[PDB]
Every structure is written in C-alpha cells, then in structure tokens.
Design a protein around this ligand. Structure first.
Ligand SMILES: C[C@H](CCC(=O)O)[C@H]1CC[C@H]2[C@@H]3[C@H](O)C[C@@H]4C[C@H](O)CC[C@]4(C)[C@H]3C[C@H](O)[C@]12C
Ligand SMILES: C[C@H](CCC(=O)O)[C@H]1CC[C@H]2[C@@H]3[C@H](O)C[C@@H]4C[C@H](O)CC[C@]4(C)[C@H]3C[C@H](O)[C@]12C
Ligand SMILES: CC(C)OC(=O)[C@H](C)N(C(=O)c1ccco1)c1c(Cl)cccc1Cl
Length: 226
C-alpha cells in the first residue's frame, strides 16, 4: 500500500462510517438538553423486565444492522470470503456497537440517548443487571474523555472489526493484511491531525474484549429466558 492507497483507505472507511453512523453527531449534541423527566424515568423503572428487554433488544438489533452495513461498504471486507466476513461480524459487531455508544453518551451528566431522550443508567433498573450496565456507562465515559472525532471513531471501529486473531478464519493472512493496512492508515491520519497522543490513551485490547464477554453472556441469558 502506497500513500495514495493509505489515503484512499482512510477515505473509504470515513465515508462508510458517515453513511452508516445511524445517528448524526450534530443531532445527538443538539438533543443533550432533551432529558427524561423524573416521571418518565419512573415510567421506565416500573416496566417489566420482559418489556425492557424487548425495547433494548430492538435498540441493539437496529444498531447492529448499521454496523453490518458499515462492514459491507469497507474497502477490503467484501474481498474476503463469506465465512470470514461472518466470523468477523459475529465476533466484532457488538463490540463496535459498544464503542459507537460514546457518541450518544453525555459525560457532563452521565446520560445516554435512548428512545428519543437522554437518561441515566437508572432508566434500565428493571433489567436487574446494574453492574454490567454501569461498566458499559464507565466504558463510554472513558472513551468520551478522548473527544473522538467522527473520522477517528470511523477508523477505530474499523479496527475493532478487522481483527485477524478471531478464531475460525479461513484466510487469516488476508485478514492480517487488511488489519495492518488499517492500523497504518489510522496511525497516519492521527499524525496528519496531531492526534498521535490518543494512541497511548486507547483502552487496552483486553478491556473491550472482557466487557463484551460479560455483555454477550448476559445477552444470551436474556435471549434464552425469552
Ligand atoms: C452472534 C453473537 C454470538 C452468539 C453465538 O455464540 O453464536 C450474538 C450474541 C449477542 C447477540 C444479540 C443480542 O442478544 C441482542 C439482540 C436480541 C434479539 O433477540 C436478536 C438480535 C440481537 C441484536 C442479537 C444478535 C446476535 O445473536 C448476537 C450479536
Ligand atoms: C435478528 C435481526 C432481524 C430483525 C428483523 O428484521 O426482524 C437480524 C438481521 C441481520 C442479522 C445479523 C447479520 O445477518 C450479520 C451476522 C450474521 C451471523 O449469522 C449472526 C450475527 C449477525 C451479526 C446477525 C445478527 C441478527 O440475527 C440480525 C441483526
Ligand atoms: C444486557 C442488556 C439487557 O442490557 C442492555 O441492553 C443495555 C441497557 N444496553 C446495552 O447493552 C448496549 C448499548 C450498546 C451496546 O450494548 C444499552 C445501554 Cl447500556 C444504553 C442504551 C441502550 C442500550 Cl440497549
């Protein structure tokens, strides 16, 4: 990959992200003052776990569908074989959704955009897993301290997905090459923007992996109990 190729790769990732970001950053920042009232929060807390799971599962289903579309518009992802495309999506799609959340997260008051307004994590009380939820909020909080640009979140989420270490890949060397190209493209774009300092501040790879382990576990328990 040349400099033209690395620059084209950056452009491709950023364009795909912009077209698949689901919620526009401008709309999310504008809505920060639109915050659930005490009555609306109590309204959520009184809902059954069943209904709350039904709303969350719908929210997550939609978010994952945009991530699938992100992958498919990515330079190189469609060049991979079907099996590998699926292995990567299966392992990474939800990890991308967790990362994507930080944009919809307001660190000033610790709220998230959910069903039209911002609310704290207490909104989700009826689900009965406050420790996992607070870890998700904590993760979003630490990411928001980096003030990710749109292009940065584009490149970073592309790297969460294009990971050659996922078990079950049939063309490991081809995924490696795509991964290496994205790592360099990311590093290069950060230097052009004087943002190299975020590299040392990025969460350790095991952090998102360990959070997604617990997450996918609880998700599957809700999936089966339904
Ligand atoms: C594919 C992956 C791993 C499952 C496996 O061990 O094979 C699983 C675990 C968490 C799952 C998701 C979560 O349970 C949340 C959603 C629940 C809905 O009932 C289906 C879509 C939904 C968006 C799920 C899609 C998919 O089955 C996920 C992403
Ligand atoms: C359950 C939901 C369908 C909702 C609907 O329209 O009724 C479907 C449609 C697209 C699905 C995803 C896509 O097919 C891509 C992935 C394919 C893998 O087989 C499972 C995980 C995977 C990440 C899927 C999870 C889930 O089952 C999704 C999100
Ligand atoms: C384990 C299941 C039952 O808990 C969730 O579903 C939680 C509520 N949840 C998430 O898990 C989530 C959000 C993004 C990725 O995962 C979520 C959050 Cl933390 C904020 C806004 C919207 C949602 Cl949907």
């Amino acid at each position: 990959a040349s400099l033209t190729e690395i620059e084209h790769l950056v452009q491709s990732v950023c364009k795909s992200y912009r077209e698949t970001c689901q919620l526009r950053l401008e709309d999310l920042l504008r809505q920060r003052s639109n915050i659930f009232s005490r009555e609306e929060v109590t309204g959520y807390q009184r809902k059954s776990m069943w209904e709350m799971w039904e709303r969350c599962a719908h929210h997550l289903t939609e978010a994952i569908q945009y991530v699938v579309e992100f992958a498919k518009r990515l330079s190189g992802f469609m060049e991979l074989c079907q099996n590998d495309q699926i292995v990567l999506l299966k392992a990474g799609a939800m990890e991308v959704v967790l990362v994507r959340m930080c944009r919809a997260y307001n660190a000033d008051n610790r709220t998230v955009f959910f069903e039209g307004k911002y609310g704290g994590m207490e909104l989700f009380r009826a689900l009965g897993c406050s420790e996992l939820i607070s870890s998700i909020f904590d993760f979003s909080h630490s990411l928001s301290a980096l003030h990710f640009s749109e292009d940065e979140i584009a490149l970073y989420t592309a790297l969460v997905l294009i990971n050659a270490h996922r078990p079950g890949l049939q063309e490991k060397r081809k995924v490696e090459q795509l991964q290496y190209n994205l790592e360099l493209a990311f590093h290069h774009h950060l230097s052009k923007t004087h943002r190299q300092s975020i590299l040392a501040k990025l969460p350790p790879k095991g952090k998102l992996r360990s959070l997604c382990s617990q997450h996918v576990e609880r998700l599957q328990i809700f999936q089966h109990l339904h």
